Specification:
transferase, alpha+beta, six-stranded mixed β-sheet, Phosphorylase Kinase, domain 1, 9 helices, Transferase(Phosphotransferase), domain 1, Mitogen-activated protein kinase kinase kinase 7, 32% helix, globular, two-stranded antiparallel sheet, binds the ligand NC(=O)c1cccc(-c2cc(-c3cc4cc[nH]c4nc3O[C@H]3CC[C@@H](O)CC3)on2)n1
Length: 304
């Protein structure tokens, strides 16, 4: 790709917005444009920096963060500023939590799958994200647009134990020959998480090896009460122990694109508060946070 060798005299830092998977992300203003500058925090983060610079220059997609340029002394990346913060803060963050509809849960998953499909379509070698999880998915335009970030783990299609235990494919930690179908497993977990508004494997106590043993032995998140059968089949196909039994990310884009007919209003910004910070009863099945009543209504209009 093509990056700008920006000097520190051209970038104006406003505040520290937090730390991502690696480095320190700071709010900044460069050439009448709001940018995010990820700087080196420790000398150990130089491998992840070279990798993210190498991969981010190749990518160009609306559902993936835009890398404007990079600096040399000291080395830092200058990407676009994601106004709405991370999806993890929207779902499980500090109060007040924002209200979101079933259209938002599906739109975010569609945009995530669209982004991952562009990475998996890369030539001559596909680009696997390996760390697909809500802390790495940012929101912009009133929380209506999702953008995948943190490509420090990303690699060309291996190295085992990449990501966070709750959204990690079982073959990744098993020391098996994993493929781009490991991102598909993560997507299925993210789908469950945005529909229920629950952190996957919260009941299974830490450390990560406890979740790894559970997922490795077939344990998946609880089934969702009243979840539409088309969505339930897509979600549990992504959770398959066999990665070849999981659908391709391009098939997920086609399927989610088609379901969006029954999920209108995804372009409405998140502006209402949410005091329904209530974790209901666990009895093998969980209640969805979102409501599928409007889906069933629109589906009946087309299918008898
Ligand atoms: N990490 C990256 O690769 C990357 C790449 C491109 C843009 C950005 C980015 C993150 C933020 C941000 C904005 C707000 C507003 C309220 N709260 C926020 N929290 C924010 O970020 C935190 C949560 C996500 C971590 O990755 C970073 C800390 O704005 N732009 N991050």
């Amino acid at each position: 790709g093509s990056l700008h060798m920006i000097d520190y005299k051209e970038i104006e830092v406003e505040e520290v917005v937090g730390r991502g998977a690696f480095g320190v992300v700071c709010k900044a203003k460069w050439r009448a444009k709001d940018v995010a500058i990820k700087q080196i925090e420790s000398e150990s983060e130089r491998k992840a920096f070279i990798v993210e610079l190498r991969q981010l220059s190749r990518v160009n997609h609306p559902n993936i963060v835009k890398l404007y340029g990079a600096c040399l002394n000291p080395v830092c990346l200058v990407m676009e500023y994601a106004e709405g913060g991370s999806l993890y803060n929207v779902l499980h963050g500090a109060e007040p939590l924002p209200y979101y509809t079933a259209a938002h849960a599906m739109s975010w998953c569609l945009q995530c799958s669209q982004g991952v499909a562009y990475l998996h379509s890369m030539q001559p070698k596909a680009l696997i994200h390996r760390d697909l999880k809500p802390p790495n998915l940012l929101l912009v335009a009133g929380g209506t647009v999702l953008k995948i970030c943190d490509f420090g783990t990303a690699c060309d299609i291996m190295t085992n134990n990449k990501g966070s235990a709750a959204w990690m494919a079982p073959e990744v930690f098993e020391g098996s020959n994993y493929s781009e179908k490991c991102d598909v497993f993560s997507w299925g977990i993210i789908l469950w998480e945005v529909i229920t508004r629950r952190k996957p494997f919260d009941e299974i106590g830490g450390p990560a090896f406890r979740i790894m043993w559970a997922v490795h032995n077939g344990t998946r998140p609880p089934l969702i009460k009243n979840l539409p059968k088309p969505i339930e089949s897509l979600m549990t196909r992504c959770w398959s122990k066999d990665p070849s039994q999981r659908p391709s990310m391009e098939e997920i884009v086609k399927i989610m694109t088609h379901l969006m007919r029954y999920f209108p209003g995804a372009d409405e910004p998140l502006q209402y508060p949410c005091q329904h910070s209530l974790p209901p009863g666990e009895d093998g099945r969980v209640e969805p946070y979102v409501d599928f009543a409007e889906f069933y209504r629109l589906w009946s209009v087309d299918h008898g």
